[PDB]
Design a protein around this ligand. Sequence first.
Ligand SMILES: NC(=O)c1ccc[n+]([C@@H]2O[C@H](COP(=O)([O-])OP(=O)(O)OC[C@H]3O[C@@H](n4cnc5c(N)ncnc54)[C@H](O)[C@@H]3O)[C@@H](O)[C@H]2O)c1
Ligand SMILES: NC(=O)c1ccc[n+]([C@@H]2O[C@H](COP(=O)([O-])OP(=O)(O)OC[C@H]3O[C@@H](n4cnc5c(N)ncnc54)[C@H](O)[C@@H]3O)[C@@H](O)[C@H]2O)c1
Lengths: 304, 302
Amino acid sequence: MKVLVAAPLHEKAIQVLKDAGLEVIYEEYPDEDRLVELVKDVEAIIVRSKPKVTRRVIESAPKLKVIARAGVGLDNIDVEAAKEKGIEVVNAPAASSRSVAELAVGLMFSVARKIAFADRKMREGVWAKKEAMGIELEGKTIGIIGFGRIGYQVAKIANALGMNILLYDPYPNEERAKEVNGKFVDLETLLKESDVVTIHVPLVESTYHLINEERLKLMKKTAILINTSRGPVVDTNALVKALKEGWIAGAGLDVFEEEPLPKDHPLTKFDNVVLTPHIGASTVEAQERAGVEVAEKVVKILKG
Amino acid sequence: MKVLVAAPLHEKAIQVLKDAGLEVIYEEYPDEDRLVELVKDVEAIIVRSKPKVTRRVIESAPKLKVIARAGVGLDNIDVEAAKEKGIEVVNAPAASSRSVAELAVGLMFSVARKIAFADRKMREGVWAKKEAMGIELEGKTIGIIGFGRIGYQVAKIANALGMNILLYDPYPNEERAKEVNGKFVDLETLLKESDVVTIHVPLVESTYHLINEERLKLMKKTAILINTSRGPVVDTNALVKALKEGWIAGAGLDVFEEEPLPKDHPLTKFDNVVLTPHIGASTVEAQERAGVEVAEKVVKIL
Ligand SMILES: NC(=O)c1ccc[n+]([C@@H]2O[C@H](COP(=O)([O-])OP(=O)(O)OC[C@H]3O[C@@H](n4cnc5c(N)ncnc54)[C@H](O)[C@@H]3O)[C@@H](O)[C@H]2O)c1
Ligand SMILES: NC(=O)c1ccc[n+]([C@@H]2O[C@H](COP(=O)([O-])OP(=O)(O)OC[C@H]3O[C@@H](n4cnc5c(N)ncnc54)[C@H](O)[C@@H]3O)[C@@H](O)[C@H]2O)c1
């Protein structure tokens, strides 16, 4: 049996494949034509955000058993074509849960204590101690919208910081909430009582622009918004307005409705926001973990 | 007895004085002149980084019993002139402990995940996703040099973040270590085994330039250094060299040997350093606890 690795993969992940006795074909980011030629005799394919596993590619792989994505999401995989041929499609979301949570917490600290701001000023020869007055997090209430894999990890860390945890999930997991001493409440209550609101929901019709003007106005004027889920979950225009009018005190953002962010975007003009280029899963540990996770899943399907 | 207030203080603070049955004189940041007449009748004075308590002032107040600083450090107070007249001077260290600890952690996060760097680039119209690969902290080892008030809080936070804790203190408190599951080890071991080294010692003879070239070489090439204690504890020139040579991966600094920092200081040129202007104690909460803590001291005494 052969596995085609069409993207960069960690040594240990490649090692999981070989220790299983599988043949590994390794050529990153091939074009479709080349890909179609590489999949003819493979039982599995492993990719990252690319290359694109189209229908043409799948219909050309007689032996294909599984399509694996080292990370989250299958936007680059024709999931319908796979389903038609009875080909399993797997990924490794759990691999970056902790890293996304850690970034969310990092953003919260940067906004609350004005660290990016102060550092930015320092490099301009300005000693901005007077305006780097921030806030202490111990005892504050953090409102977690979306209590899933990442939301759970954030709650774990919040509990580590001595924060009061509020959770709001249409499908509340009582057991896990109890483990982090988190209390489930309606979204209105969470928005009104939180000092820090962090978003961890998937992007579906139900969550598109979930954070809009109506809900931003419900938040405390002293509150901070953190979004590491997806751009479109937050109405950018409403957030910009909320920041300008002082409806909230600041925001930490890792995802946006335009990626990359256009030049001179309104959000980049606020001193009370910290922006990161969608690096929630960008840790060597999370990237390695995703590769190893899908390698194991591949092995279980094939050799099992 | 009467108590003067020469700096911005807080409702709760001002009131704890009146509860003890003292009178309160309040003016935000006065001056040596008016300061002389104001302190003349007062038996106590309270301040922050200001105003400045010179020897000329200490002399005007014959009734002055105690000088209180709502915070840490008395550089703006002629503690000797006061020591001559027998005037007790106090401050509120414990009040800012948590805030400094939280900054050290926030700095650890910003360096580890290149947050300040990424944000800075974003504002320059640069999407540095591919230059911002960072590291995950869970399971990593944090080395705490100076297991005191602030060192303890950092360990408390770190232990819960799932980090392995190493501690090095000439005066080890085993019981407190057990509280945060920290392990005491010699300094060399801490430096060689830590992924994050954070300094929380006072500036004393034995801590001057404690983090020197030799010790920096001992650290891991992938390690991060955090310093929220005092600039002098770290040999700035040795750190710049370590960063330039890649002996360590980066650093988060809130204190420096030159404050404010100079115009084109070499530290401001590294993308792997996060610099803050001595804001460790700069939180409204810390500021309030400070005023309240010294108020209780002004009361207990008079
Ligand atoms: N920033 C990054 O680099 C990065 C990396 C990985 C994932 N992400 C994104 O961040 C989020 C991660 O979420 P996860 O992995 O924990 O997903 P998950 O599926 O594990 O958990 C999602 C939770 O949201 C809840 N939920 C669903 N609809 C909701 C609603 N309308 N209101 C409130 N809660 C709702 C679900 O019940 C579930 O408990 C996703 O949007 C994911 O795409 C970002
Ligand atoms: N950055 C800020 O804004 C800010 C604010 C307040 C305090 N600080 C500084 O933080 C540092 C720690 O303050 P603290 O309140 O925790 O002090 P502390 O007195 O409570 O604890 C200091 C610890 O250092 C230990 N120690 C002494 N000498 C040592 C040595 N040679 N090597 C290792 N450890 C040694 C002591 O035993 C003690 O455990 C000080 O330098 C203080 O000035 C900074």
